């Protein structure tokens, strides 16, 4: 009878989405097969009938290398085969990731790139493989690529890093594409740049991998990012693992999951703007948009009186004060709908808008629909 | 302008689906005002200006008692007023929760109610609270509910745990409602009930209060949960801390957050059917029928033969077996769109449809809609 219980345990964590995506994806292959699997989640650190784990962490790859029950390890690829642990390694393709955002920058505009990696002193080792991934693709362009090695995930001198890494930020040429190992590290940037008042994406561009939806939610700037194939990755692991239970003999398998898409956000909203009095001029429009902005400020904000400020912006991106105080005040509203569970009349208030109609009326004038039509529409 | 950027620190656990539900809820308020805050997610073992923390944890209190920076605790509700901690508290209203599930069962048909909850041990206070709530929700019913304190999620001797909840589980009358304090220990019910070959929701009906997105998939029996209000929790979590970074004149704050909706899945998709032969009949019809089995693989698991089992089928639904095989297997397929990261070509093959045209066919025989008109208009 259909009840061959296969008590399988999964070794991951819910901290990073990259993990929360993999296990959920196992639950994906679980429907397609309706197998009678007894799936457990026990791990800090008996075992069970079968396993699945995050082998990027050597800690679990070296201890479990004694049992032989069906184990399918997940993690990050290695262009260098011999750098692979003992077990069928179904992983994501580091290089496919880095190069994934890279093109994204070049697709929008960018011609100067820098990589914000990570100290070889952090347990993690994919950091590194994302560094060679970067190198190989940059050496084809014109402008070389600068690389930085931040601090511990969260060092003692929490504050020191905040200033040590910053120096680097000013050391790069303007309009750069700063790629970060993870959305975790690219955070450091979006926050320091917010401190050193370093317009983004105007002066520099930020971009990460993990795209984890928890962090990127909270900050002034939305962190544009790549989208690993984590779901698909943890879905493959369960299918291949099922093929290890029917006992297939197999040469250590190593398939590579291709990153999905690349969700685009503010952190990269580049528009090849090259005019100084227009640069800050813009970043400004953005920050204070839904705060109801006038001229006087706009002027000394880029640091240019009325005339000397007018004579300028008027030439480069074509869009009156009103033309841009609107779109950046609409975006701020479009964002507070699709990816931000809230209200519809509360958003018209904290976004500078008189009545509902005065909010709805101006919407259709741009999009052929309305708020309620859009709210659930492209929501996430 | 405003350059006063506070260094606000959020104290939560990125692992459980709850804390995260809140942390993002904060990043929700960071968006309504574009406040000058540097939110810092931390909580591993110096702080900052404003702080938020999971006060459901006792260690967190003795860890913060006596620091003066404004703290806003976030956690579960408490029946006893004196219960709540010395600091302000935006909390989830446990009562509202248990009660929301309650109604769902007080409506789906179930008259006899149960309750699987944590022991005393798990310092999880809210638990003792969600329990006490149950006690009050049942008293004025017909059949006294049940109060079973499990043991541990990851106990000392996991095996033995099986034993004991299998025991109590087998003590419950057919058609009981199991409201599990959490979507975490709620599964423990559905994975044991998978081993006792116990019908769900044919015999007993399960229901959790977390709406954990991780486990959702994992157990074939789509668990039905009480989607909380942890989002609206994180938004006032910040609205209060903001108002707090203004030395306002306010007494110790104690505001509860009721849950939004309750997602319905198999676990509670119970239908009044007391005819033993058709009870277990649908156990395969609703479990593995989506696979594609003979119209006889269905009359034996039940309790009888072919002519002697389908006999009282007209009693149940009104039709026979073949008059539900083309209005059920679809449902085991149509769901692979709503709560699964999958496609539609995949499912049409699984249930077996020469094309999407046929999948289109029996799609209008109950909902005049279409696969693509129901894939978007209803997804999520």
DSSP B67-122: --S-EEEEEE--SSGGGS-SSEEEEE-HHHHHHHHHHHHHHHS--EEEEEE--SSS
CA distance A297 to B18: 43
Q: What is the CA radius of gyration of chain A?
A: 24
Chain B from 218 to 237: CB within 8 A of any A CB: 218-220, 231, 235
Question: Which letter does DSSP use for residue A82 in this model?
Answer: G
| Cα angle value A56/B156/A52 (rounded, 5°) | 25
CA distance A46 to B94: 35
**A377 touching chain B per CB within 8 A:** no
CATH class of B1-92+228-260: alpha beta
Phi, psi (degrees; rounded to nearest 5) at A194: -70, -25
CA distance B252 to B204: 43
| Option in B216, B217, B288 nearest A2 (CB) | B288
The three-state (H, E, C) secondary structure of B286-355, written as one string: CCCHHHCCCCCCCCCCCCCCCCCCHHHHHHHCCCCCCCCCCCCCCHHHHHHHHCCCCCCHHHHHHCCCCC
Q: CB burial class (10 A; 0-12, 13-18, 19+) of residue B365?
A: exposed
CB contact under 8 A, A350 and B33: yes
Contacts of A218 in chain B (CB under 8 A): 23-24, 26-28, 30-31, 39, 41
B26 touches B68 (CB < 8 A): no
CB contact under 8 A, B30 and A191: no
Omega prior to A201 cis, within 30 of 0: yes
**A349 touching chain B per CB within 8 A:** no
B95 touches B229 (CB < 8 A): no
CA distance B100 to B27: 27
CA distance A20 to A13: 7
| Option in A36, A191, A336 nearest B31 (CB) | A336
Contacts of B16 in chain A (CB under 8 A): 14
Model resolution, angstroms: 3.5
Please state the separation of Cα A222 from the chain's center in Å: 10
**B217 touching chain A per CB within 8 A:** yes
CB contact under 8 A, A28 and B341: yes
B213–chain A nearest CA distance, Å: 8
How many Å from the N-terminal Cα to the C-terminal Cα in chain A? 42
3 state DSSP class of A177 = strand
| Option in B15, B216, B287 nearest A14 (CB) | B15
Question: Which letter does DSSP use for residue B356 in this model?
Answer: H
CB contact under 8 A, A3 and B291: no
CB contact under 8 A, A154 and B31: no
Beta strands in chain A (DSSP E): 8-11, 50-54, 71-74, 88-89, 91-92, 113-116, 145-148, 176-180, 204-207, 225-226, 256-257, 262-263
| Option in B213, B288, B340 nearest A28 (CB) | B340
Q: What is the CA radius of gyration of chain B?
A: 24
What are the tokens at B108? 């789906």
CB contact under 8 A, A218 and B20: no
What CATH number has the domain spanning A272-380?
1.10.10.60
CA distance B42 to B18: 15
What are the tokens at B293? 């089995």
Residue A10: name the closest of A72, A67, A86, A62 by CA. A72
The position carrying tokens 């994302």 is A130
Task: Give how far Cα A289 sits from Cα of A296, A346, B356, Å.
Answer: 15, 17, 47
Q: Which residues, listed in sequence order, are joined to residue A53 by a DSSP beta bridge?
A: A11, A73
Q: Which residues, listed in sequence order, are joined to residue A148 by a DSSP beta bridge?
A: A116
Strand A50-54 relative to strand A262-263, pairing = unpaired
CA distance B2 to B103: 49
Residue B130: name the closest of B168, B174, B175, B92 by CA. B92
Give the other-Cβ count within 10 Å of A289's Cβ. Answer: 22
CA distance B51 to B53: 7
Identical fold between B1-92+228-260 and B272-380 = no
What string of DSSP letters covers A45-67?
----SEEEEETTSHHHHTTSTT-
The position carrying tokens 């975790």 is A184
CA distance B275 to B202: 11
3 state DSSP class of A104 = helix
Q: Which residues, listed in sequence order, are joined to residue A54 by a DSSP beta bridge?
A: A74
User: Which residues, including other chains, have CB under 8 Å from residue B360's CB and lie 6 or more apart?
Assistant: B370, B371
The position carrying tokens 């005065």 is A358
Contacts of A346 in chain B (CB under 8 A): 32
Please state the separation of Cα A97 from the chain's center in Å: 11
Give the other-Cβ count within 10 Å of B343's Cβ. Answer: 12
A253 touches A89 (CB < 8 A): yes
CB contact under 8 A, B217 and A158: no
| Cα angle value A127/A74/A228 (rounded, 5°) | 60
| Option in A27, A36, A346 nearest B218 (CB) | A27
CB contact under 8 A, A217 and B346: no
CATH class of B93-227+261-271: alpha beta
The position carrying tokens 């791990």 is A43
What are the tokens at A80? 């260098």
Interface with chain B: mutation pick from A17, A27, A380, highest number of B CBs within 10 Å: A27
Q: Which residues of A175-192 are buried (b: 16+ CB within 10 A; e: fewer)?
A: bbbbbbbbbbbbbbbbbb
Method in brief: X-ray
Domain map of chain A by residue range?
1-92+228-260, 93-227+261-271, 272-380
User: Which residues, including other chains, have CB under 8 Å from residue A365's CB and lie 6 or more apart?
Assistant: none
Residue A207: name the closest of A134, A328, A115, A130 by CA. A115
Please state the separation of Cα B371 from the chain's center in Å: 27
**B159 touching chain A per CB within 8 A:** no
3 state DSSP class of A36 = coil
CA-based torsion, B210, B216, B220, B221: positive or negative: positive
CA distance B150 to B168: 10
How many interface pairs between A and B have CB atoms less than 8 angstroms apart? 116
Residue B233: name the closest of B29, B35, B39 by CA. B29
**A152 touching chain B per CB within 8 A:** no
User: Which residues, including other chains, have CB under 8 Å from residue A307's CB and lie 6 or more apart?
Assistant: none
Element at A173 (helix H, strand E): none
**A203 touching chain B per CB within 8 A:** no
B239 touches B257 (CB < 8 A): no
* Residue of chain A whose alpha carbon sits nearest to that of B190: A38
CA distance A359 to A355: 6
Q: Which residues of B109-127 are buried (b: 16+ CB within 10 A; e: fewer)?
A: ebebbbbbbbeeebebbbb
Q: Which residues, listed in sequence order, are joined to residue A178 by a DSSP beta bridge?
A: A114, A206
What are the tokens at A119? 């100290």
CB contact under 8 A, B23 and A335: no
CA distance B55 to A105: 43
Contacts of A36 in chain B (CB under 8 A): 194
How many Å from the N-terminal Cα to the C-terminal Cα in chain B? 42
């Amino acid at each position: 009878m259909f009840t061959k219980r296969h008590r399988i345990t999964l070794l991951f964590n819910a901290n990073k989405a990259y993990d929360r995506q993999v296990v959920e994806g196992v639950g994906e292959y679980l429907q397609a097969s309706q197998s009678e699997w007894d799936i457990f989640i026990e791990e800090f650190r008996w075992l069970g009938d079968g396993v699945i784990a995050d082998f990027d962490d050597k800690q679990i790859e070296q201890a479990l290398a004694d049992v032989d029950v069906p184990i399918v390890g997940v993690g990050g690829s290695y262009h260098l085969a011999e750098s692979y642990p003992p077990v069928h390694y179904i992983a994501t393709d580091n290089y496919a990731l880095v190069e994934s955002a890279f093109l994204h920058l070049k697709e929008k505009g960018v011609n100067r790139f820098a990589f914000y990696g990570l100290p070889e002193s952090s347990g993690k080792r994919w950091a590194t493989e994302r560094e060679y991934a970067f190198r190989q693709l940059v050496a084809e362009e014109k402008y070389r690529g600068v690389v930085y090695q931040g601090l511990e995930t969260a060092p003692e001198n929490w504050q020191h890093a905040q200033n040590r890494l910053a120096d680097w930020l000013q050391t790069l040429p303007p309009q750069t594409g700063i790629i970060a190992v993870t959305d975790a590290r690219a955070r450091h940037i979006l926050q320091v740049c917010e401190h050193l008042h370093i317009p983004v994406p105007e002066k520099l561009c930020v971009i990460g991998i993990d795209n984890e939806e928890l962090t990127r939610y909270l900050s002034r700037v939305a962190l544009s990012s790549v989208a690993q194939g984590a779901r698909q990755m943890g879905y493959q692991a369960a299918k291949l693992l099922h093929r290890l239970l029917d006992k297939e003999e197999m040469p250590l398998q190593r398939i590579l999951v291709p990153p999905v898409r690349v969700i685009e956000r503010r952190s990269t909203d580049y528009r090849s703007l090259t005019d100084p009095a227009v640069i800050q001029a813009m970043h400004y429009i953005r920050n204070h948009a839904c705060k109801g902005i006038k001229v006087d400020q706009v002027l000394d904000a880029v640091g240019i009186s009325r005339s000397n400020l007018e004579k300028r912006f008027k030439e480069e991106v074509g869009e009156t004060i009103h033309a841009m105080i609107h779109a950046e005040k609409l975006e701020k509203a479009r964002s507070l709908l699709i990816s931000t569970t809230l209200s519809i009349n509360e958003i018209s208030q904290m976004c500078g808008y008189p009545s509902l109609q005065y909010f709805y009326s101006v919407f259709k004038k741009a999009y052929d629909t309305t708020p309620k039509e859009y709210r659930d529409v492209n929501s996430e």
